[PDB]
Amino acid sequence: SGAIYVGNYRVVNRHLATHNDWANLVWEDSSRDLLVSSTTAQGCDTIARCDCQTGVYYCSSRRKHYPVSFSKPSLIFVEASEYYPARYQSHLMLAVGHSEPGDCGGILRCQHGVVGIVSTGGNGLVGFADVRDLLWLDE
Ligand SMILES: Cn1cc(NS(=O)(=O)N2CCC[C@H](C(N)=O)C2)cn1
Ligand SMILES: [Zn+2]
Numbered sequence: 001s002g003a004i005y006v007g008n009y010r011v012v013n014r015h016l017a018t019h020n021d022w023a024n025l026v027w028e029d030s031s032r033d034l035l036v037s038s039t040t041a042q043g044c045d046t047i048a049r050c051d052c053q054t055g056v057y058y059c060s061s062r063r064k065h066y067p068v069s070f071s072k073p074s075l076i077f078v079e080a081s082e083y084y085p086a087r088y089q090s091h092l093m094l095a096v097g098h099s100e101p102g103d104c105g106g107i108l109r110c111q112h113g114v115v116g117i118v119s120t121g122g123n124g125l126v127g128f129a130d131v132r133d134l135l136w137l138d139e
Contacts, residue, residue, distance in 0.1 A: 002058070002105025004114055005043030006137050009036050013104045013119055013129070015083035031090045033119045033129050036137070046113035048132050055110040057118060057128065061100045068095035070108070073130040078120055091130045092120065099126040 004011040012021060014028055014035040021037040028035040053072065056065050073091040080086040081101075093108075099121030106118040108128045120127030131137065 001060075001102065002107060002117060004045050004047075004107065004117065004131065005039065006045045006047055006114075007043050007139075008039055009043060009137055010039050011036050011117070011131060011137070013117060016104060029090075030084070031088070032092075033084075033089060034131070036134075047134070047137055048110050048112035048115050049135075050110065050112045050132065052110035052112065052115065055108050055115050057095075057097070057108040057126070058106040059098060059103055059118075059126075060106055061103050062098060066097055068097050068108075068126075070095040070128060073133070076120075076127065078127075079122070089120065089127075089129075091133065093128045093130055094125050095128070096124060097126040098124070 017035040024038040026036045056067050070093045075088045075090050076092045078089045103118045108115045116128040116130040119129040
């Protein structure tokens, strides 16, 4: 679990969104596994605006942060799960590292701020849903 809080927005994995998230829906994209809902309180997270390919992510299944190199956002095949059939997930970045499903929502951060959140995993790789292109999160 986990979310990004920036301005009056909350960014979560779409497959973990709550009833309140859907009742205050701002934007959602099944192909990216993202959902953004509105909040009443102000968010203070800083979103990175860059092309970094190195950062640190939080892994709840190890209670640890790991430094990683990660690929540029791209269209990646994701095998079927209880939340989606087998499909291409867009704007996904991969790194060599550990993750389990409950790790979804952990933040990946570079020197510039929040890059994205844990979204996929398996075969010793971890995938992060990029949020650097969502320029509207800051206005
Ligand atoms: C973070 N993580 C996720 C998994 N398992 S998964 O890749 O099957 N995952 C299950 C939950 C939905 C995910 C998606 N974005 O389609 C895929 C293992 N580690
Ligand atoms: Zn960066």
